[PDB]
């Protein structure tokens, strides 16, 4: 028996691609978006029946509609330039640790986990090498984990069966790095 | 929509607490929000507050707008309450688990609605109040929510942690477990 609760949500979205700025605007009751401005459309359009009293009344009022059309170049492109000076230039370097999942015998099967933490942005490349050869199979990746603090995290595991003298290398390619970063692990 | 980057102002209002929230996210990471009680702008990183600023009036005003259309929609919908979408919870460490080196435990509550929620950090059954922090109720593109909860800790082989979550879409409190080694 849940308590009484009504939720109203709003979203002002700027899409930056090439040199463009597409302004999306969403009006949302509970989890249902009913009214929306699309800059490629030029006017409000009701997504559901709930937003017909607004879409028609908000439209045909020129003072509102003109303000909304200029948004892509008034706050979207404006904010984007401010983001290119600070937010885009943020580059935090990935820290790499390598370890087996569990400790035990040598010739027994195990998982080598390459744990890459605290990097930004999220586009990262992790590769595995055994004795100089890329292991292209047996690679289990917990794809990109967002930490909620402007840093990403990923775990890339290799299905291994280590022999004495085998050398495993994890390679990491990130935009914050000039060259690939490697971390090594020998079976002993 | 094709885009190199997405820049989304996002805000919500509701009957229970949190009654309101206003923020701006860049590529799904919260850049800044507007403290509606202290009437201020709060930047997530010093990198941000050192550069630009935001009119805290622009958030408080959009909240009053959101509140005005909260009603007139309560009435228009014949008082429609939404289904309680239950949360999914994950607990994972911020850095590799080295015994001794201080770490941060992350509790990720995801895919829930409405944005009402209790979270408790339990160490060995007992709750932890010191050394904890949490993110905002972060909106998703499918208009549910997700939240982050943090606890700084020193990995001990004698310690055991739980993230206890309460939501109206759950029958009982949800306990998610994490353990060293």
């Amino acid at each position: 028996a849940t308590p009484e609760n009504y939720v109203y949500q709003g979203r002002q979205e700027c899409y930056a691609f090439n040199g463009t700025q597409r302004f999306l605007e969403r009006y949302i009751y509970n989890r249902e978006e009913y009214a929306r401005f699309d800059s490629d459309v030029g006017e409000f359009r009701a997504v559901t029946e709930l937003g017909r009293p607004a879409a028609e009344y908000w439209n045909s009022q020129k003072d509102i509609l003109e303000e909304k059309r200029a948004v892509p170049d008034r706050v979207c492109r404006h904010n984007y330039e401010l983001d290119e000076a600070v937010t885009l230039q943020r580059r935090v370097q990935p820290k790499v640790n390598v370890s087996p999942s569990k400790k035990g015998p040598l010739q027994h099967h195990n998982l080598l986990v390459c744990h890459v933490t605290d990097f930004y942005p999220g586009s990262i490349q992790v590769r595995w090498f055994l004795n100089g050869q890329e292991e292209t199979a047996g690679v289990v990746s917990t794809n990109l984990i967002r930490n909620g603090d402007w840093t990403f995290q990923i775990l890339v595991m290799l299905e291994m069966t280590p022999q004495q003298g085998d050398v495993y290398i994890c390679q990491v390619e990130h935009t914050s790095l000039d060259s690939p970063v490697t971390v090594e692990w020998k079976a002993q | 929509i094709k885009a190199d980057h997405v820049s989304t102002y996002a805000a919500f209002v509701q009957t229970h607490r949190p009654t309101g929230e206003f923020m701006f996210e860049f590529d799904e990471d919260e850049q800044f929000y507007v403290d509606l009680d202290k009437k201020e702008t709060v930047w997530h990183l010093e990198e941000f507050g050192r550069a630009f600023s935001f009119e805290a009036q622009g958030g408080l005003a959009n909240i009053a707008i959101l509140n005005n259309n909260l009603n007139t929609l309560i009435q228009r919908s014949n008082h429609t309450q939404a289904a309680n979408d239950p949360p999914e919870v994950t607990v994972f460490p911020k850095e590799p688990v080295e015994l001794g080196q201080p770490n941060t435990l992350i509790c990720h509550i995801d895919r829930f609605f409405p944005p009402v929620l209790n979270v408790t950090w339990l160490c060995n059954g007992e709750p932890v109040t010191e050394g904890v922090a949490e993110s905002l109720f972060l909106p998703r593109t499918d208009y549910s929510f997700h939240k982050f909860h943090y606890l700084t800790f020193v990995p001990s082989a004698e310690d055991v942690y739980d993230c206890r979550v309460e939501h109206w879409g759950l029958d009982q409190p949800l306990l998610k477990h994490w353990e060293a080694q």
Partner: peptide
Amino acid sequence: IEFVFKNKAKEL
């Protein structure tokens, strides 16, 4: 009836 959203921006 229903008010439109206000659009502000970050400023240096």
